[PDB]
Design a protein around this ligand. Structure first.
Ligand SMILES: *[C@@H]1O[C@H](CO)[C@@H](O[C@@H]2O[C@H](CO)[C@@H](O[C@@H]3O[C@H](CO[C@H]4O[C@H](CO)[C@@H](O)[C@H](O)[C@@H]4O)[C@@H](O)[C@H](O[C@H]4O[C@H](CO)[C@@H](O)[C@H](O)[C@@H]4O)[C@@H]3O)[C@H](O)[C@H]2NC(C)=O)[C@H](O)[C@H]1NC(C)=O
Ligand SMILES: *[C@@H]1O[C@H](CO)[C@@H](O[C@@H]2O[C@H](CO)[C@@H](O)[C@H](O)[C@H]2NC(C)=O)[C@H](O)[C@H]1NC(C)=O
Ligand SMILES: *[C@@H]1O[C@H](CO)[C@@H](O[C@@H]2O[C@H](CO)[C@@H](O)[C@H](O)[C@H]2NC(C)=O)[C@H](O)[C@H]1NC(C)=O
Ligand SMILES: *[C@@H]1O[C@H](CO)[C@@H](O[C@@H]2O[C@H](CO)[C@@H](O)[C@H](O)[C@H]2NC(C)=O)[C@H](O)[C@H]1NC(C)=O
Ligand SMILES: *[C@@H]1O[C@H](CO[C@@H]2O[C@@H](C)[C@@H](O)[C@@H](O)[C@@H]2O)[C@@H](O)[C@H](O)[C@H]1NC(C)=O
Ligand SMILES: *[C@@H]1O[C@H](CO)[C@@H](O)[C@H](O)[C@H]1NC(C)=O
Ligand SMILES: *[C@@H]1O[C@H](CO)[C@@H](O)[C@H](O)[C@H]1NC(C)=O
Ligand SMILES: *[C@@H]1O[C@H](CO)[C@@H](O)[C@H](O)[C@H]1NC(C)=O
Ligand SMILES: *[C@@H]1O[C@H](CO)[C@@H](O)[C@H](O)[C@H]1NC(C)=O
Lengths: 98, 226, 142, 294, 327
């Protein structure tokens, strides 16, 4: 609740000793946030939906760099029967920059 | 990166020289802008320290800017037992921040006590007093201390210097001397720890604490406790 | 639990060598300034040590040291050597004392207290002539 | 040899630049003071003004494993005068030349049984127009079956000619005719994509690096930023589908006349192996001094 | 066997008295301002609390040792400091201007990175010293001030002239320093004759003897070597804070926000569990090494106070204990 709360919990008693203690300091509120770097063309997932879908040993490859992606235009129209995510949160795959 | 309604009020120049949560399209964190001279390869755009943290940055338009860290105020506390008296200290900082924007849990203040410039920084909860205490029991660092009233108030004091008795010298055959004229028999009192309480332990009354199964399991460990 | 007991063995051997160190410092205290007077500045007792007393404690050992504690220091004059003008080789120096220009001439005083007393042979000894010493002619000391 | 304290052609960190500190890094590096994979180009037979039959070594049939790419020095013999390779009694000023590479993953015997056939989709890169164009293409090669042809009879090896009196004079650049000389020996099929670069010409030496990783084939050079300096900056990233384990150098011919036979560059190739080196990032950031571990 | 010539050789040494008296916050260091981190902190936290008052107790023990040793070395009455004191001797280098010129130039040659005790945080907004708060720690201020050890140096400087006459410290006898040297040389076994007509040459060669150590301040001085090794000891001690958060401790990453907003809640709780475990063991290593440094500082402080009370203010008879040759 206060400085005395974290004080007395650290000593686990209602009676403590006098003393200079490095109490847990604060962090100032940042003035804001900056989101800037170059963006050009958006990410183009057309060859994923173009052509014959290849085989499990013919797994066709797509590299995406320097583009802008949106899963709300991609996964929303995907009739996803099953979704799994190995060592990653499924929600943040459409949130962070890589 | 994902799509966004690109906010105009998010540029680097908007809060230059100010602490912001930096997010350089994957380079995430929170730090303080500054303007520097260009160092390193401008095509790399990202300059890092010896500990894998960003120090500089080549802007898109071409104005090199450093970001070191968004350093915050270190905070310490004083409290005295048997006199319900307590105050806060802030290290190596001008009295610059007021109660608006902290972090962590709810800070507690009392009646206004206010922000005072000390050589160690800024202090809240102290009243100025040019006092001198040679034998301060709970000092405030550097050469500072506070002493509580016998609703009391701790009051400021510098750690006083014990002035020796100043005696001069004569450059002649006559010499200047100083001499005790009274005395006492002071007792220098101290203590040492010679032999602690020595203790032994069982393997199976500390570890099996009587467990049959435990027994058969510890036989692979065997001679460790031995 | 075995890792906790490895930590226990480590801290116990640390306390064991610390107790060993305390043992030689213990014998140093009890054999230097307790059963004698240490010639070291504030070795166990602050100031001029006089006596010391030692008593056992269930894990340790306890030390008082009664010592001379000066107070009320005043300002005086002292000399360097009482030597004859006619015989510069005839000089005297105090046996751990001081020369004081008393009322009622330089006389002997102990080196720890305002204790002036007339100069005798039992507190001084003959020394070499020096240019920095002093002459007396109106009353040569015995 | 190659000095590491002088930092002769060593990979730069891809995105982690430092300043004025020494830093350890695990990557792909060669050893210290090595020999190399020494090859050299030369000029063909000529008499008067007409250039006669070619002049190439057995370097087309010498194949090495890709391992982890390789680093090429270019024009270390430039600015100087060396003996003409075809005519040892004749000497001329050494001019910088650039090599043409092919990359794949299969080895086979030729129409005459000489080993070196590559199957399926393979990469070929070639400098043309006095080294102005650096065109690369990952296609299907088809050997021809006529006289002196790779699938034909009376065949020994393959080479690419170049007629500098008409090929790469001021302007012109002969619609990349050395690619047609490659086409005079091979044919293109079933190709997916294709890359081309513009590189200017100078007189200072050149350091080039090639490697591959599952995301792509990475090509590094100095010229692009450090024209006066030297470093590995990734000027190309081929979107490759499969890894590469074999490569070869395409021999190249120059249709120069006999009286004006000019000495060409003597290039070195050093292989890249997984090592850990320490780097001296200076204040400006130019890496100039490095040191090995093992 | 008897020598027919002599000189005055200086022996240089140093004692690491008071180690860096520091502190580290629980939450800003281990947790670094992250929400799910403090709720998982709640899971543990027993370690953090306890080791904080453990380091507080060690620090106050060191402070008690420091105040005890400056209480011991405080001469109850001393001599004033003026320029030109000490006769013909050029002891202006040890004479304070307070700032003694000898320790001024030692502070020049010793790479001193003062941890911003007056600018600090403000020094970081205007521009390694700022790196004391990246994850977060604080090397506490001294409990002393410069001018305060300037006063202690003045006190011991007076005690040099005042003590080395006769055992028994109740009388203060701060002789004119040349005659103090004369009496000290007479005491340590030099005849009054050569001390009576040959003061000039011995004074001059003592002068260039004390001058040679001024220009000798370089790597060749072993005391410089142990001072700078102590500086490196402090540097590696603070690196034990500064360098370990870069380690993942087996996690998939070492950044907390990375974990909390790019992982699912169960797996991110597991990764925070791993990170906090590794970090608390690094804290235990820190506690152990500062305990070692604290006891070493205690014994070194005992050694330093014994050296300064016996063979500095007076002439100890122990053969070569603190100075080689006839000190
Ligand atoms: C064949 O012979 C030619 C001679 O014509 C050589 O070319 C010279 O190469 C040297 C070595 O790099 C060059 O020396 C460098 O000069 C720089 C200044 O150049 C200025 O002038 C040129 C020409 O106008 C401009 O294009 C340029 O932008 C500059 O304005 C110096 O700054 C260099 O020092 C810096 O770089 C080195 C290397 O990184 C660092 O070690 C230094 O500390 C410093 O940071 C350097 O001294 C010279 O300029 C070239 N001359 C010409 C005319 O180009 C060829 O190298 C040579 N080839 C072979 C294979 O031998
Ligand atoms: C006693 O008086 C004699 C007088 O000769 C002193 O001897 C000389 O004193 C002068 C000045 O005081 C010095 O410049 C000389 O060097 C002294 N001579 C010698 C041989 O030392 C003497 O100093 C006086 N004091 C004593 C003997 O204690
Ligand atoms: C780059 O590093 C060099 C090497 O340490 C720095 O040069 C040192 O500068 C300090 C400060 O004046 C001197 O005390 C050292 O003697 C110098 N050492 C050497 C070997 O020159 C240089 O200051 C650094 N520059 C920058 C911009 O960081
Ligand atoms: C005592 O030593 C100091 C230290 O060298 C001397 O100070 C030097 O004085 C000269 C001129 O007299 C200057 O050129 C030097 O720069 C000074 N050195 C320093 C380090 O400041 C001083 O002169 C000496 N005094 C005597 C009486 O010998
Ligand atoms: C940022 O700074 C640019 C030049 O840098 C100048 O020198 C360095 C060493 C710093 O001290 C910096 O503050 C100086 O200004 C300017 O060309 C540029 O205009 C500056 N940016 C803005 C927004 O004014
Ligand atoms: C506090 O008072 C002293 C004298 O009483 C004065 O020197 C000092 O400047 C005062 N402090 C402030 C912050 O004004
Ligand atoms: C010393 O002080 C004590 C107590 O103050 C007093 O009884 C005694 O007479 C004093 N002695 C002298 C010599 O002043
Ligand atoms: C090279 O430059 C020429 C002229 O500027 C241009 O026509 C050509 O397309 C360029 N080629 C490449 C690959 O950039
Ligand atoms: C001692 O040696 C030094 C240098 O060798 C010389 O200057 C001095 O005169 C010598 N002194 C004696 C007494 O021999």
């Amino acid at each position: 609740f206060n400085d005395l709360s974290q004080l007395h919990c650290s000593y686990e008693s209602f009676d403590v000793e006098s003393g200079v203690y490095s109490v847990s300091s604060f962090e100032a509120k940042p003035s804001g946030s900056v989101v800037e770097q170059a963006e050009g063309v958006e990410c183009d997932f057309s060859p994923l939906l173009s052509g014959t879908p290849p085989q499990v040993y013919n797994f066709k490859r797509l590299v995406f760099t320097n583009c802008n992606y949106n899963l709300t235009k991609l996964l929303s129209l995907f009739s996803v029967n099953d979704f799994t995510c190995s060592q990653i949160s499924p929600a943040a795959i459409a949130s962070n920059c890589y | 990166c994902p799509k966004l309604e690109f906010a105009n009020d998010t540029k680097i120049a908007s809060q230059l020289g100010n602490c912001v949560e930096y997010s350089l399209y994957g380079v995430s964190g929170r730090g303080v802008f500054q303007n520097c001279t260009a160092v390193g390869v401008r095509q790399q755009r990202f300059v890092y320290d010896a500990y894998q943290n960003l120090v500089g940055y080549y802007s898109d338009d071409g104005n090199y800017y450093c970001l070191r860290a968004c350093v915050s105020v270190p905070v310490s506390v004083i409290y005295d037992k048997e006199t319900k008296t307590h105050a806060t200290l802030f290290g190596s900082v001008a009295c610059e921040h007021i109660s608006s924007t902290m972090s962590q849990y709810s800070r507690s203040t009392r009646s206004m006590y206010g922000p005072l410039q000390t050589p160690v920084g800024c202090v809240l909860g102290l009243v100025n007093s040019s006092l001198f205490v040679e034998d301060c029991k709970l000092p405030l660092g550097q050469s500072l201390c506070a002493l509580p009233d016998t609703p009391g108030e701790m009051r400021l004091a510098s750690i006083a210097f014990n002035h020796p008795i100043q005696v001069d010298q004569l450059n002649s055959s006559y010499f200047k001397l100083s001499i005790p004229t009274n005395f006492s028999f002071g007792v220098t009192q101290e203590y040492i720890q010679t032999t602690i309480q020595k203790v032994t332990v069982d393997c199976k009354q500390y570890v099996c604490n009587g467990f049959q199964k435990c027994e058969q399991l510890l036989r692979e460990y065997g001679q460790f406790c031995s | 639990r075995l890792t906790t007991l490895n930590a226990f063995v480590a801290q116990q051997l640390v306390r064991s060598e610390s107790a060993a160190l305390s043992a030689q410092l213990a014998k140093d205290k009890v054999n230097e300034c307790v059963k004698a007077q240490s010639k070291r500045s504030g070795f166990c007792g602050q100031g001029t040590h006089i006596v010391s007393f030692v008593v056992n404690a269930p894990n340790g050992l306890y030390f008082m040291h009664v010592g001379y504690y000066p107070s009320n220091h005043i300002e005086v004059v002292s000399a360097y050597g009482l030597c004859d003008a006619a015989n510069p080789t005839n000089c005297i120096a105090p046996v751990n004392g001081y020369f004081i220009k008393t009322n009622n001439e330089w006389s002997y005083t102990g080196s720890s207290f305002y204790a002036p007393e007339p100069i005798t042979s039992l507190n001084t000894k003959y020394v070499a002539p020096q240019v920095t010493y002093q002459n007396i002619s109106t009353n040569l000391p015995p | 040899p190659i000095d590491v304290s002088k930092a002769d052609g060593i990979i730069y960190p891809q995105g982690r630049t430092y300043s004025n500190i020494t830093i350890t890094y695990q990557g792909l590096f060669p050893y210290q003071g090595d020999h190399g994979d020494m090859y050299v180009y030369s000029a063909g037979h000529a008499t008067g003004t007409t250039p006669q039959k070619l002049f190439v070594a057995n370097y087309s049939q010498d194949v090495k494993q890709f391992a982890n790419g390789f680093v090429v020095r270019i024009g270390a013999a430039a600015n100087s005068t060396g003996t003409v390779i075809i005519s040892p009694s004749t000497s001329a000023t050494i001019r910088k030349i650039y090599p043409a590479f092919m990359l794949g993953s299969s080895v086979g015997n030729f129409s005459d049984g000489k080993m070196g056939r590559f199957f399926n989709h393979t990469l070929v890169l070639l400098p043309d127009g006095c080294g102005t164009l650096l065109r690369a293409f990952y296609c299907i090669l088809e050997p021809r079956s006529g006289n002196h042809c790779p699938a034909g009879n009376s065949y020994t090896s393959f080479a690419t000619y170049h007629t500098p009196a008409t090929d790469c004079s001021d302007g012109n650049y002969n619609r990349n005719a050395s690619l047609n000389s490659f086409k005079e020996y091979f044919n293109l099929r079933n190709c997916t994509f294709m890359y081309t670069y513009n590189i200017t010409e100078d007189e200072i030496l050149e350091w080039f690096g090639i490697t591959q990783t599952a995301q792509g084939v990475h090509l590094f050079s100095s010229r692009y930023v450090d024209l006066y300096g030297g470093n590995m900056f990734q000027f190309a990233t081929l979107p490759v589908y499969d890894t590469i384990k074999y490569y070869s150098i395409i021999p190249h011919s120059i249709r120069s006349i006999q009286s004006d036979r000019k000495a060409w560059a003597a290039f070195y190739v050093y292989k890249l192996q997984p090592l850990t080196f320490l780097l001296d990032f200076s204040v400006d950031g130019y890496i100039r001094r490095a040191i090995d571990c093992g | 066997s008897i020598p027919t010539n002599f000189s005055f050789g200086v022996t240089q040494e140093y004692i690491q008295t008071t180690i860096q008296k520091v502190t580290v916050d629980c939450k800003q260091y281990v947790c670094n301002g992250f929400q799910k981190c403090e709720q998982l902190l709640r899971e543990y936290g027993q370690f953090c609390s306890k080791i904080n008052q453990a380091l507080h107790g060690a620090n106050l023990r060191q402070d008690d040792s420091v105040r005890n040793l400056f209480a011991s070395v405080k001469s109850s009455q001393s001599s004033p400091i003026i320029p030109g004191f000490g006769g013909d001797f050029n002891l202006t280098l040890l004479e304070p201007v307070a700032r003694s010129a000898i320790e001024d130039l030692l502070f020049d040659k010793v790479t001193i990175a003062d941890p911003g005790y007056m600018q600090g945080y403000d020094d970081c907004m205007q521009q390694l010293i700022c790196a004391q708060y990246v994850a977060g720690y604080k090397v506490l201020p001294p409990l002393m001030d410069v001018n305060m050890e300037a006063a202690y140096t003045s006190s011991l400087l007076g005690s040099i002239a005042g003590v080395g006459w006769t055992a028994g410290l109740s009388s203060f006898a701060a002789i004119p320093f040349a005659q103090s040297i004369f009496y000290r040389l007479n005491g340590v076994g030099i005849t009054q004759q050569v001390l009576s007509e040959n003061q000039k040459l011995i004074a001059n060669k003592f002068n260039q003897a004390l001058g040679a150590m001024q220009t000798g301040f370089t790597t060749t001085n072993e005391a410089f070597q142990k001072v700078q090794d102590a500086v490196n000891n402090n540097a590696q001690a603070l690196s034990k804070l500064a360098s370990e958060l870069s380690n993942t401790f087996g996690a998939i990453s070492a950044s907390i926000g990375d974990i909390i907003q790019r992982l699912d809640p169960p797996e991110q709780d597991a990764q925070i569990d791993r990170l906090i475990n590794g970090r608390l063991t690094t804290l235990n290593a820190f506690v152990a090494q500062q305990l070692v440094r604290s006891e070493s500082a205690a014994l070194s402080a005992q050694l330093a106070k014994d050296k300064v009370n016996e063979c500095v203010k007076a002439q100890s008879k122990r053969s070569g204990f603190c100075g080689q040759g006839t000190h």
